[PDB]
Design a protein around this ligand. Structure first.
Ligand SMILES: COc1ccc(Cn2nnc(-c3cccc(C(=O)NCc4ccc(C(=O)O)cc4)c3)n2)cc1
Ligand SMILES: [Ca+2]
Ligand SMILES: [Ca+2]
Ligand SMILES: [Ca+2]
Ligand SMILES: [Zn+2]
Ligand SMILES: [Zn+2]
Length: 167
């Protein structure tokens, strides 16, 4: 016999993702690089590994859409909800959707896709929102302006509570 797992986490360390479609705002390459960097944030502090697929069903299916886009979490035009993602699991679990009514950039203008992706992949991996305003998993986008990205300790603690450290 088997019982359902108690914790919403991935029970495998080698996970896949797929970019189902792309935003007008950035090149394919820029979008691909943003997501690769976002996943590296989490793999740097856990035993998790991430591979991109060009077809089929990946664990983490990534898409861009607006307003109603095929679930109970419709988008709302510029600002507000920037994106959403499902907790670990089969099917919809882990999937991440980005609001293409946002202006996506790789800078301090509009919303930084790497930054939002890093937050959403946190949800995809099992993290809910933090109550710490400085944490990456705080609900509200608050660009620091700082030169290089460093994952705040609250988010390291959170993710390592599910998966432990990389080594
Ligand atoms: C929904 O999407 C959301 C995304 C983020 C938050 C909360 N949140 N807002 N900012 C930070 C947050 C947390 C920790 C650091 C920073 C930050 O700005 N670092 C500077 C930086 C950013 C991007 C790049 C790059 O592009 O290479 C380089 C450097 C931001 N966490 C909330 C929601
Ligand atoms: Ca999935
Ligand atoms: Ca929005
Ligand atoms: Ca757009
Ligand atoms: Zn959605
Ligand atoms: Zn969130």
């Amino acid at each position: 016999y088997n019982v359902f797992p108690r914790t919403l986490k991935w029970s495998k360390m080698n996970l896949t993702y797929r970019i189902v479609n792309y935003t007008p705002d950035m090149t394919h390459s820029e979008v691909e690089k943003a997501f690769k960097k976002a996943f590296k944030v989490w793999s740097d502090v856990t035993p998790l590994n991430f591979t991109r697929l060009h077809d089929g069903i990946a664990d983490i299916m990534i898409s861009f859409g607006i307003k109603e886009h095929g679930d109970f979490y419709p988008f709302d035009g510029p600002s507000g909800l920037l994106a959403h993602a499902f907790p670990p699991g089969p099917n919809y679990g882990g999937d991440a959707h980005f609001d293409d009514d946002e202006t996506w950039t790789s800078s301090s203008k509009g919303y930084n896709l790497f930054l939002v992706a890093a937050h959403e992949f946190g949800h995809s991996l099992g993290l809910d929102h933090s109550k710490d305003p400085g944490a990456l998993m705080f609900p509200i986008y608050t660009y620091t302006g700082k030169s290089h990205f460093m994952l705040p300790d609250d988010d390291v603690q959170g993710i390592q509570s599910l998966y432990g450290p990389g080594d």
